[PDB]
């Protein structure tokens, strides 16, 4: 993206552009939510049988 942007445009769009993308992805990624839980790794049903 920033390649192509730089290539044809020259540069200044790619600058503001990348700034806005850092901005936006950080914003909604805090609004996106992200975490981990104990059940995000598994207790498979076939545990005793494999044993």
């Amino acid at each position: 993206m920033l390649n192509t942007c730089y290539r044809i445009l020259g540069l200044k769009p790619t600058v503001i552009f990348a700034d806005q993308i850092m901005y936006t992805g950080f914003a909604y990624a805090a609004r996106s939510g992200a975490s981990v839980g104990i059940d995000d790794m598994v207790i498979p049903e076939k545990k005793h049988e494999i044993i």
Partner: protein, 50 residues
């Protein structure tokens, strides 16, 4: 054990609870792991570093 113990607390089995921001009051998307860890301070302080 911890799951029986946690629901004895009436809490979620995995302790995963919907959380609200207050910058707008809303809910986030997914629930989040919640619970209490036992943590440590150090002598390696910005006080002791700067």
């Amino acid at each position: 054990e911890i799951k029986e113990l946690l629901k004895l607390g009436d809490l979620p089995t995995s302790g995963q609870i919907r959380l609200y921001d207050g910058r707008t009051g809303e809910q986030f998307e997914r629930p989040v792991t919640v619970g209490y860890m036992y943590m440590l301070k150090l002598n390696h302080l910005v006080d002791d570093k700067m």
